Design a protein around this motif. Sequence first.
Motif, mmCIF file in Angstrom:
data_model
loop_
_atom_site.group_PDB
_atom_site.id
_atom_site.type_symbol
_atom_site.label_atom_id
_atom_site.label_comp_id
_atom_site.label_asym_id
_atom_site.label_seq_id
_atom_site.Cartn_x
_atom_site.Cartn_y
_atom_site.Cartn_z
ATOM 1 N N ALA A 152 -71.651 -90.022 51.774
ATOM 2 C CA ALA A 152 -71.198 -89.736 50.422
ATOM 3 C C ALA A 152 -72.229 -89.837 49.306
ATOM 4 N N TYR A 173 -59.971 -81.426 42.275
ATOM 5 C CA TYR A 173 -60.763 -82.200 43.214
ATOM 6 C C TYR A 173 -60.120 -83.138 44.212
ATOM 7 N N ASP A 179 -58.949 -86.114 46.438
ATOM 8 C CA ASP A 179 -59.573 -87.428 46.598
ATOM 9 C C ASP A 179 -61.082 -87.470 46.342
ATOM 10 N N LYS A 180 -61.705 -86.324 46.087
ATOM 11 C CA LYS A 180 -63.140 -86.329 45.828
ATOM 12 C C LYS A 180 -63.387 -86.828 44.413
ATOM 13 N N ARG A 228 -67.234 -86.579 44.653
ATOM 14 C CA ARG A 228 -67.933 -86.739 45.926
ATOM 15 C C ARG A 228 -68.255 -85.389 46.545
ATOM 16 N N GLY A 269 -69.643 -86.350 52.706
ATOM 17 C CA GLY A 269 -68.958 -87.493 53.287
ATOM 18 C C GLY A 269 -67.498 -87.205 53.549
ATOM 19 N N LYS A 270 -66.893 -87.953 54.471
ATOM 20 C CA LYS A 270 -65.487 -87.767 54.831
ATOM 21 C C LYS A 270 -64.573 -88.422 53.822
ATOM 22 N N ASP A 271 -65.121 -89.390 53.099
ATOM 23 C CA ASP A 271 -64.383 -90.126 52.090
ATOM 24 C C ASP A 271 -65.337 -90.926 51.208
ATOM 25 N N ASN A 272 -64.786 -91.698 50.281
ATOM 26 C CA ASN A 272 -65.607 -92.464 49.362
ATOM 27 C C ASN A 272 -66.411 -93.603 49.948
ATOM 28 N N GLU A 273 -66.073 -94.029 51.156
ATOM 29 C CA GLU A 273 -66.812 -95.121 51.765
ATOM 30 C C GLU A 273 -67.867 -94.626 52.749
ATOM 31 N N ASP A 274 -67.721 -93.379 53.186
ATOM 32 C CA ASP A 274 -68.662 -92.764 54.122
ATOM 33 C C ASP A 274 -70.053 -92.871 53.526
ATOM 34 N N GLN A 301 -57.347 -83.891 39.065
ATOM 35 C CA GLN A 301 -56.795 -84.227 40.370
ATOM 36 C C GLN A 301 -56.418 -83.005 41.189
#
Length: 478
Positions: free
Chosen positions: A399, A448, A450-451, A388, A391-396, A445
């Motif tokens: 993203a 990266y 959580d990206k 990613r 985005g702030k996270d995977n759902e943003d 891991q």
Amino acid sequence: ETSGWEDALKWLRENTPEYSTATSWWDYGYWIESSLLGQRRASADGGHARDRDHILALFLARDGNISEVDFESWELNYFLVYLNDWAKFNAISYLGGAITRREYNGDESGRGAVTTLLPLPRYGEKYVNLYAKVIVDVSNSSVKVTVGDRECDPLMVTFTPSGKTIKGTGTCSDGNAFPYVLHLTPTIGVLAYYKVATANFIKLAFGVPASTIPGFSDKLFSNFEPVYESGNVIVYRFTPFGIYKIEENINGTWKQVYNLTPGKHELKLYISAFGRDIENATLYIYAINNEKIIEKIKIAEISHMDYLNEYPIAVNVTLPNATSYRFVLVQKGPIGVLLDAPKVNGEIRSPTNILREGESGEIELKVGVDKDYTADLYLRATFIYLVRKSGKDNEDYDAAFEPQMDVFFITKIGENIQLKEGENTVKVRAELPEGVISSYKDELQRKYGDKLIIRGIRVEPVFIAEKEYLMLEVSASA
Ligand SMILES: [Ca+2]
Ligand SMILES: [Cl-]
């Protein structure tokens, strides 16, 4: 009811080696031949699975350095681009990490989605996509773009062959931003969101040299050579090494030539390295008479060449007669096409996860090749994952997920195997070190956090031999 698919596929079967490998976005090739017309020739006929969907898109949807995907690692020979795929380019652009989730299909409140690509067939001084209510009026040499009721002005418009380039304002009379680029060509025009204006798919499908990087477009058409087309299907012949320009010394002046004449020549070669470096190769020119090699002339030796930073090769050569010449590069590469499910300790396994981490066993493989090869055999891992980039996270919805493909060899388990033309069988003992897979998965891991998003880990058997790569074939001239 075919869009040229059967003409193209049926052409491949009758014009390419028995153990070639082709790909198409979303596997339309395999599906057409197998599910619609009934067929099989190997445990695979092209690329598959959701991890290649990501890397196939990375190539189709991007341009420049990040699009130089390593197709050779797949022992790829042919690529079939399907014009109709423009309709899916939104997904292709998304999987390819070109656009964000929002531009892909809008956010929670149904706003933001974009139209990455839109083709505009001619009408006569007018280019129009009926289905989208878009009209492009050029006549007067000013370019008027109508999108629905609104009147919009590209960020830029291009003409080809012309090469002219009006500089729009990327705005609509709506007042809104219209970050689009319009490429116009005699028979069709294409309106493309900026993030995919130079998309390689545009370069292959619609004949628009679209590249935001000088030279790239020339190089790319040296790695992908169109060899046939039916309806909306063009079959390209891949080659991770080609020549986009041959310069000949004519009076102390370097000029570009397009064919060679028998005799001595002082030449300058321009090679495109698509996806992987040139590693300890040897180049040759093969004099060809009646489609018969009549001589092999070694012309140079390249120890190494960066695939994102080529350079020209100087070379003086005396050439015999013949009708044409073939520049060939030979170096280590993959060969072989499993003809059956590889077996391990007697049982059946997946030719992509032949052995688990730590596990050892007796591997058996039916291997087909179109030529006599002497090869080593390895267990090669291939990680395909997303990173990613926004985005702030995977759902943003901001993203966007940039796809990566890491490939490393783990251990040699074969050795000087004499693979002979046609089918073969290879039984060998093998073991996959304890930790090799989880080790890397941990390094990712660590790089990266959580990206990261692992999409596919592969552990497969690969025969590596010295293989000939056709870089370019010219014709003998007067
Ligand atoms: Ca290159
Ligand atoms: Cl490889």
